[PDB]
């Protein structure tokens, strides 16, 4: 499975969550930014590694990083 890490430079714009094709990410309350939200990655067993969440992130540097890890049949995107 890949590791998706969310850092405190997150601004809760939700764009990483909206860009995820496999529903790894969701928003949780934070009170660490003024949106009141921060991304989280519980279903990271579903992560394929497309890094659409990283492309959608506006902060410099990214508040979300995907580290490609051990490949499973889900992270390899195999329908066979």
């Amino acid at each position: 499975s890949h590791s998706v890490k969310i850092y405190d430079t997150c601004i809760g714009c939700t764009q990483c969550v909206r860009a995820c094709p496999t529903d790894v990410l969701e928003m949780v309350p934070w009170d660490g930014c003024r949106a009141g939200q921060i991304a989280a990655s519980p279903r990271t067993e579903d992560c394929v590694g497309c890094k659409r969440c990283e492309t959608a992130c506006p902060t410099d540097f990214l508040s979300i990083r995907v580290y490609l890890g051990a490949e499973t049949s889900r992270s390899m995107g195999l329908a066979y």
């Binding site: 890490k5 529903d23 969701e26 009141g36 519980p42």
Partner: protein
């Protein structure tokens, strides 16, 4: 156990294979107000029935591609789709929406599962976690 009519479809070569029945299958259910043509994520055009529809797909990404098509390519939008994971013993598990809202909104009760209170440029540099097993983000400090 899952309610819904299979969408009217002629079949394709892009559908379920062995791994669907030996590893895992996914199902997406949705209610449509009219009988109308959508695009299968497996290739082709199917027709959703008026009422409750249930479709088995091979990947969760296919079920989420269909769901994104339902809520964006149709007026009125179909936003009530539910995605389940089916196991070879028959066990069905409701996965999407994980909570019951929709990941893009914020629910009180979800909980942190990837948060690292840092700022990326301050992970522990790899010279110190060498023969440990941890790699640089699965840690706890900040250097």
């Amino acid at each position: 156990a899952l309610t819904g009519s299979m969408p009217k479809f002629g079949g394709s070569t892009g559908g379920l294979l062995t791994a669907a029945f030996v590893e895992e299958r996914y199902a997406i259910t949705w209610t449509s107000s009219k009988e109308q043509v959508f695009e299968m994520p497996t290739g082709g055009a199917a027709t959703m029935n008026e009422g409750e529809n249930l479709l088995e797909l091979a990947r969760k990404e296919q079920c989420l591609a269909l769901g994104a098509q339902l809520r964006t390519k149709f007026k009125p939008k179909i936003t009530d789709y539910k995605i389940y994971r089916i196991f070879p013993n028959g066990e069905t598990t409701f996965i999407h929406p994980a909570d019951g809202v929709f990941p893009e909104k914020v629910n009180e009760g979800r909980g942190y599962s990837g948060k690292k209170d840092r700022r990326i440029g301050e992970n522990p540099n790899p010279a110190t976690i060498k023969f440990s097993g941890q790699n640089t983000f699965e840690t706890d400090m900040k250097s």
